[PDB]
Design a protein around this ligand. Structure first.
Ligand SMILES: Nc1nc2c(ncn2[C@@H]2O[C@H](COP(=O)(O)OP(=O)(O)OP(=O)(O)O)[C@@H](O)[C@H]2O)c(=O)[nH]1
Ligand SMILES: [Mg+2]
Length: 660
């Protein structure tokens, strides 16, 4: 009676998620006509980026109304590039509907969605799409069984002359065919009956075994009622003990409403997950429309709300004079909201992704669903195209990051460049396009490498600053010795009190400042001991400034005779390529001045450890997926610095010097 469900539709790119979402919206009456991704007419993919790349860049909300029941379906993206939106959609749902292309089977995007859902403690259901494009359903079920585990087949495909035309409801022993956008009951083909009965028995047994009460009856001799089985089934799915497997296609228009009925029957309600109590909500995503402003998307996990109500938040009281349910980019006004509802809050400049909202006692960390986002690992130096852009780029980035916090903006300490980190070439491309939607043109470039300097031999020298400008003068005198070393260190070796200990901080600051720009090529210096072993001061003219200057003057003089050497960053790779996709990964590193460190070949997938310079893998994200059959992801992490091979070393030194 007036049930509610919040479900995240996830899965690998191209598994027919958005097409299924369109079919659901159309078949329920929420939409006049079902659009197509190819034509850019769907409810989910409305932003310029989504339509341009023909992929779900942003999670779309599809509020489904069916016979009084409500299913708030979140149509999430498929590519790992949009992990931010994917993980947020799962954080917002009480269960995951995982689409699996029949012709491809479980893919990388399937495993990632599945794992995040499992960690969030969410029930899982699988929907098999694209059976009309090919694939063997029965072999697919076996693969899902061996890969996912306790799957539970709900549907089997109905075939007519080799053509997929419908489905067979295993449990009820009924078949349905579709044609002209119409569902009709059909007979279970004679040749299929024995197999269908086998699946039915296995389904009955799988459900009975998860319920102690039913296992007692089945054993005691008592009868198992249909209502008893339904309850056991629902509870088993709620606890993640069974994973229903449905068959549906928005393109072929097969099993669409049946999938909705199954969602209501199999997946849990907000109450079965959080129980009843005061309002509890969370902003799981944010959209910043170029014209409409910021809109916050909230998931109400518990409680009820009416227009005029308010919620507490870390940012203070949040009034909601108007309640809106989102449907794509549109906000539909409602007169009330119950747990399970997904709401859209306009003019939400003060609400950000991750903020918890509540009434009553403030929730503690464990009471709210949370899925951490991996740090973005693809950097690109950012540059406004021109004048106006450079000026509007500040506000444009603010909006971009509010809407997509999976993107990180940083200022390289050494290089000084403004870097934007994303999760892939595609993610960054959408970021670029989005900035353009905000009226700003930018261009990317490979980040400048943060080269460093060091010394190879010991050297000593004096640094002295003595001048008199005005009333009093300044005096600083320092003797410095530089020693090559693995780690930087300041060593105060002053004796006889020739320099008071109070100038130690100033002297070190001077050494550090000068070290910001080496003598060899103007890069930061590292790996050296700075030893202050003698000097002098004047009680009258000595000061921190004088010694900082004296110390700096000494560093530059001394480093010039310590045999400078140019260093470069060196990272370690941890590639993950399939069985025969290893002879292509270890073949690529050779052109990148690499070095193998190990290879964990276990079963099918075998890890491939390595070590390679940073200057050689700045755009290795534009290659790995195209060599590991796309079923592999590269990993780059800082290891240590090293001397730039004499060849390049000289080359690089020349450039930096050439101009300034
Ligand atoms: N033959 C066939 N094609 C389908 C089916 N479902 C979707 N397609 C098509 O396959 C493509 C996948 O479409 P979407 O529905 O955009 O897929 P998605 O899984 O939502 O894709 P992403 O948002 O990129 O993760 C589209 O070009 C659809 O026209 C299906 O059941 N059968
Ligand atoms: Mg999609």
């Amino acid at each position: 009676g007036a049930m509610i469900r919040t479900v995240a539709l996830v899965g690998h790119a191209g598994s027919g998620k958005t097409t299924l979402t369109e079919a659901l919206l159309y078949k329920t009456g929420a939409k006049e006509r079902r659009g197509r991704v190819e034509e850019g007419t769907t409810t989910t993919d409305y932003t310029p980026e989504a339509k341009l790349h023909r992929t779900t860049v942003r999670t779309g909300v599809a509020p489904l109304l069916f016979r009084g029941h409500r299913v708030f379906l979140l149509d999430a993206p498929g590519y790992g590039d949009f992990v931010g939106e994917i993980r947020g959609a799962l954080e917002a749902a009480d269960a995951a509907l995982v689409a699996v292309s029949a012709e491809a089977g479980v893919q990388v995007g399937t495993e990632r969605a599945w794992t995040v859902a499992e960690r969030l403690g969410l029930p899982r259901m699988v929907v098999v799409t694209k059976l009309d494009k090919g694939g063997d359903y029965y072999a697919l079920l076996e693969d899902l069984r061996s890969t996912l585990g306790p799957i539970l087949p709900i549907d089997l495909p109905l075939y007519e002359g080799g053509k997929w035309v419908g489905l067979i409801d295993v449990f009820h022993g009924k078949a349905y065919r579709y044609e002209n956008g119409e569902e009709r009951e059909a007979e279970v083909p004679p040749e299929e009956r024995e197999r269908v009965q086998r699946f039915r028995q296995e389904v009955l047994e799988a459900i009975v075994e998860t319920d102690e009460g039913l296992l007692e009856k089945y054993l005691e001799g008592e009868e198992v009622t249909g209502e008893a089985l339904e309850k056991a089934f629902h509870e088993a799915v709620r606890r993640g003990l069974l994973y229903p497997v449905a068959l549906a296609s928005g393109e072929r228009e097969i099993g669409v409403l049946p999938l909705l009925e199954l969602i209501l029957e199999a997946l849990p309600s907000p109450t079965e997950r959080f129980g009843d109590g005061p309002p509890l909500a969370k902003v799981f995503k944010v959209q910043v429309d170029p014209f409409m402003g910021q809109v916050a998307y909230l998931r109400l996990y518990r409680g009820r709300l009416k227009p005029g109500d308010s919620l507490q938040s870390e940012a203070g009281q949040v009034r909601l004079p108007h309640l809106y349910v989102p449907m794509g980019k549109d906000l539909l006004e409602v007169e009330e909201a119950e747990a399970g509802f997904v709401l859209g809050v306009p003019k939400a400049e003060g609400l950000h992704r991750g903020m918890v909202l509540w009434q009553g006692e403030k929730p503690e960390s464990e009471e709210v669903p949370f899925a951490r986002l991996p740090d973005p690992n693809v950097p690109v130096a950012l540059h406004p195209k021109g004048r106006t852009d450079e000026a509007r780029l500040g506000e444009a980035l603010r909006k971009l990051l509010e809407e997509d916090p999976s993107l990180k903006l940083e200022r390289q300490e050494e290089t000084g460049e403004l870097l934007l980190w994303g999760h892939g070439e595609l993610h960054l491309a959408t970021a670029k396009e989005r900035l353009q939607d905000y009226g700003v043109e930018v261009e990317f470039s490979v980040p400048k490498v943060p080269y460093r300097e060091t010394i190879k031999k010991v050297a000593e020298g004096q640094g002295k600053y003595k001048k008199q400008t005005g009333g009093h003068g300044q005096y600083g005198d320092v003797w410095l010795r530089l020693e090559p070393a693995s780690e930087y260190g300041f060593e105060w070796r002053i004796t006889g009190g020739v320099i008071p200990s109070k100038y130690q901080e100033a002297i070190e600051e001077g050494i550090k400042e000068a070290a910001k720009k080496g003598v060899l090529a103007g890069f930061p210096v590292m790996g050296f001991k700075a030893i202050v072993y003698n000097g002098s001061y004047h009680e009258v003219d000595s000061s921190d400034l004088a010694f900082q200057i004296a110390a700096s003057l000494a560093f530059k003089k001394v480093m010039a005779e310590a045999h400078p050497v140019l260093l470069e960053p060196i990272y370690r790779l941890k590639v993950l390529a399939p069985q025969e996709r290893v002879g292509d990964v270890l073949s690529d590193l050779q052109a990148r001045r690499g070095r193998i460190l190990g290879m964990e070949q276990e079963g099918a997938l075998s890890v491939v450890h390595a070590e390679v310079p940073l200057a050689e893998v700045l755009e290795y994200y534009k290659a790995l997926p195209g060599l590991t059959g796309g079923a592999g992801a590269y990993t780059l992490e800082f290891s240590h610095y090293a001397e730039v091979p004499p060849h390049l070393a000289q080359r690089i030194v020349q450039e930096r010097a050439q101009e300034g």
